[PDB]
Amino acid sequence: MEHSSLETIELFIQHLTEAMILVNANGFIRSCNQRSAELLDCPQVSLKGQDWRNFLTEHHQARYDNLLSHDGQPVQHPAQETTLICASGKAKDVELSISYIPGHEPMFVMVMHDL
Amino acid sequence: MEHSSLETIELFIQHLTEAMILVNANGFIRSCNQRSAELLDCPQVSLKGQDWRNFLTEHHQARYDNLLSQPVQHPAQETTLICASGKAKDVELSISYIPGHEPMFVMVMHDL
């Protein structure tokens, strides 16, 4: 899985009726879908490039200081209650899961289920 | 998508901590991940190849009998599944349609 696989995955996510974003090791959004744009209340063009930590509450923010080192190992966990914060200040309670995809350019996949 | 991409997507699915399966137009599981095997009480190696209808309630939505016939697709909605163990489990199932000469369908199951 390299730069070519990335495109494949990015396109794949576009078809999914699940809200999800692709994030790099530094925590910045590399790719997303229309569902995540609606959930996070932000257009895809403006969503990519953003630090995903921008949508987390201050508490959960510290929870994800570094994606490559858990609160020593790269973070990943099945869905769990999390509160998201939109630029408008609107807070949505969701179920967040994080997946880790190792590689020279490690990616993290966030699937957020709106509650 | 093309066969070439199938490998990539499949490997991608196997890494996620969300239960999801990739099924073909005929309704047969083409790919799955350990999370789905856990949720469905079925060994991962046995999931592939089955008719996904085997995990649906007897009197299920007729729509699920023909995915390609607009094709079946919808966000996560409450659904009761029957695990291989025979036990029922309420989940929020979402179905996504992937166009192509060989159309695919991907299901994501969230266990409440």
Domain range for A94: 2-115
Q: Does B89 touch chain A (CB under 8 A)?
A: no
Helix axis angle, B3-13 relative to A3-15, nearest 10°? Answer: 80
Q: Residue A76's closest chain B neighbor by CA?
A: B17
Chain A residue numbers with beta carbons less than 8 Å from the beta carbon of B5 are 8, 12
User: Beta strands A19-24 and B104-111: pairing type?
Assistant: unpaired
Question: CA-to-CA distance for B24 and B9, rounded, in angstroms?
Answer: 14
Residue type, A106: P
Question: CA-to-CA distance for B19 and B111, rounded, in angstroms?
Answer: 9
CB atoms within 10 A of CB B100: 12
Q: Name the token pair of B19.
A: 């239960």
Report in angstroms the alpha-carbon separations of A78 from B17, B51, B98: 5, 26, 25
Question: CA-to-CA distance for A79 and A63, rounded, in angstroms?
Answer: 15
**Residue found by looking up tokens 């999801």 in the block:** B20
- Print the SS3 string covering B15-26: CCCCEEEEEECC
Q: Does A104 touch chain B (CB under 8 A)?
A: no
Closest-CA residue to B32 (of B80, B104, B100) = B104
Closest-CA residue to A60 (of A47, A46, A71, A68) = A71
Q: Is residue B83 classed exposed, middle or buried when 0-12, 13-18 and 19+ CB atoms within 10 A define those classes?
A: middle
The minimal CB distance from B15 to the residues A16, A18, A101 is found for: A101
Give me the half-sphere count of Cα atoms (radius 13 Å) on the Cβ side of residue B17: 18
Q: Is residue A3 classed exposed, middle or buried when 0-12, 13-18 and 19+ CB atoms within 10 A define those classes?
A: exposed
Q: Residue A5's closest chain B neighbor by CA?
A: B8
Question: CA-to-CA distance for A100 and B24, rounded, in angstroms?
Answer: 26
The minimal CB distance from A17 to the residues B9, B16, B75 is found for: B75
Question: CA-to-CA distance for A97 and A111, rounded, in angstroms?
Answer: 6
Question: CA-to-CA distance for B103 and B26, rounded, in angstroms?
Answer: 10
Resolution (A): 2.4
Structure method: X-ray
Q: Name the token pair of B98.
A: 């992937």
Q: Does B28 touch chain A (CB under 8 A)?
A: no
The answer to whether A101 and A108 have CB atoms below 8 angstroms apart is yes
Contact: A95, B76; criterion CB under 8 Å: no
Q: Does B83 touch chain A (CB under 8 A)?
A: no
* DSSP labels, chain A: --HHHHHHHHHHHHH-SSEEEEEETTSBEEEE-HHHHHHTTS-HHHHTTSBGGGGB-HHHHHHTS-TTS-------EEEEEEEEE-TTS-EEEEEEEEEEE-SSS-EEEEEEEE-
Question: How many structural domains compose chain B?
Answer: 1
CATH number at residue A109: 3.30.450.20
Report in angstroms the alpha-carbon separations of A91 from A33, A39, A52, B73, B111: 20, 10, 15, 28, 23
CB atoms within 10 A of CB A114: 14
